[PDB]
Amino acid sequence: WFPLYFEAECNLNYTLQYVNHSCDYSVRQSSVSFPPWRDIDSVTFVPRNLSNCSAHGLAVIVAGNQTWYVNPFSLAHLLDAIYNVLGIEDLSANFRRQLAPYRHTL
């Protein structure tokens, strides 16, 4: 038994097209000053699905109305192991299926 959590939402007005050829983790200085999980508002991801200009994937974060883009594969490979060591990887039993394609192919 564990804590219970979220869902999947439909009918959104916000969309992806805004990037206008913004296709990469263009910000790095923020990386050497990451906000911890304590200070994050939300985190996002896309396997560059809609992008001619991106292929495999990218992710974004917002913290105190502060935002920047970073690639998705390390967290995909990582959070699984983090749960496994914490012993709550079973909670991913369902959403691990959705998250499966988003680890690096090798």
Partner 1 sequence: AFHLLLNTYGRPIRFLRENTTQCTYNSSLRNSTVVRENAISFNFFQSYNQYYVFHMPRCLFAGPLAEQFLNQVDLTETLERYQQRLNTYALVSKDLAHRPHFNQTCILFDGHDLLFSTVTPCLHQGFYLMDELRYVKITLTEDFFVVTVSIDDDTPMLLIFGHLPRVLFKAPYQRDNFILRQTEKHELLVLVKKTQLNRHSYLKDSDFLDAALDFNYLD
Work out how close the CB of 85 gets to ligand NAG at its nearest, in angstroms, rounded to a whole number: 28
52 binds, among partner 1, ligand NAG, none (CB under 5 to 8 A by kind): ligand NAG
Amino acid at 103: R
Q: Cα angle at 94 between 82 and 96, to 5 degrees?
A: 45
Six-digit token string for 46 = 């896309």
Rg (CA), the chain: 15
Interface stretch with ligand NAG, choices 50-58, 70-78, 80-88, 92-100 (CB under 6 A) = 50-58
Q: Are 85 and 74 in contact (CB under 8 A)?
A: no
Q: Are 25 and 71 in contact (CB under 8 A)?
A: yes
Six-digit token string for 57 = 């994937």
66 binds, among partner 1, ligand NAG, none (CB under 5 to 8 A by kind): ligand NAG
Work out how close the CB of 21 gets to partner 1 at its nearest, in angstroms, rounded to a whole number: 18
Which of the residues 9 through 48 are near ligand NAG (CB under 6 A)?
11-13, 17-18, 20, 47-48
Six-digit token string for 101 = 């394609």
Contacting positions for partner 1 (CB under 8 A): 1-12, 15-16, 25, 27-28, 31-32, 34, 36-38, 40-46, 56, 70-71, 73-75, 77-78, 80-82, 84-88, 95, 98, 103-104, 106
